[PDB]
């Protein structure tokens, strides 16, 4: 249904923002602290199909 | 002045005095001459 | 005549600034590790200062 493209649209096309590596609280002798990100928006009409 | 904010003080200051001085030494000298070679190129009525 | 160009001279040769800087009593520092660091690094740093 329309309903299902439209769903599948919403979830395989979106930008997540996942938080970040060594966050506070850390343990104690934590190395780094980095930025996680996640899938991105589509960008060319062939990522669509 | 030798205070807190001195540094403001001292900016407004000292070039004053400094003009002041000059001003008050070149003026008593500079002035009359100015004033005839002006009264002379021009003279009144 | 040579007043006036000694004025001249002095005019351009004094430097130029906006404000006179003041004694306030306080005075602030920044610490900037590595990116990528991590809070209890940073602190180590601050102890150190």
């Given at each position: 249904?329309?309903?299902?493209?439209?769903?599948?649209?919403?979830?395989?096309?979106?930008?997540?923002?996942?938080?970040?590596?060594?966050?506070?609280?850390?343990?104690?002798?934590?190395?780094?602290?980095?930025t996680?990100?996640?899938?991105?928006?589509?960008?060319?009409?062939?990522?669509?199909? | 002045?030798?205070?807190?904010?001195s540094?403001?003080?001292?900016?407004?200051?000292?070039?004053?005095?400094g003009?002041?001085?000059?001003?008050?030494?070149?003026?008593?000298?500079?002035?009359?001459?100015?004033?005839?070679?002006?009264?002379?190129?021009?003279?009144?009525? | 005549?040579?007043?006036?160009?000694?004025?001249?001279?002095?005019?351009?040769?004094?430097?130029?600034s906006?404000?006179?800087?003041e004694?306030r009593?306080?005075?602030?520092?920044?610490?900037?590790?590595?990116?990528?660091?991590?809070?209890?690094?940073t602190?180590?740093?601050?102890?150190?200062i």
């Amino acid at each position: 249904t329309a309903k299902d493209v439209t769903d599948a649209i919403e979830s395989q096309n979106a930008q997540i923002a996942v938080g970040q590596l060594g966050g506070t609280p850390s343990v104690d002798k934590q190395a780094l602290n980095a930025t996680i990100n996640a899938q991105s928006l589509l960008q060319t009409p062939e990522q669509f199909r | 002045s030798t205070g807190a904010g001195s540094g403001g003080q001292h900016a407004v200051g000292t070039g004053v005095m400094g003009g002041m001085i000059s001003a008050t030494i070149l003026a008593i000298y500079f002035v009359p001459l100015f004033f005839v070679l002006v009264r002379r190129r021009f003279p009144l009525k | 005549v040579l007043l006036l160009g000694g004025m001249v001279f002095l005019f351009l040769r004094l430097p130029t600034s906006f404000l006179p800087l003041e004694d306030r009593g306080m005075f602030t520092t920044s610490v900037q590790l590595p990116s990528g660091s991590t809070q209890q690094q940073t602190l180590k740093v601050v102890e150190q200062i």
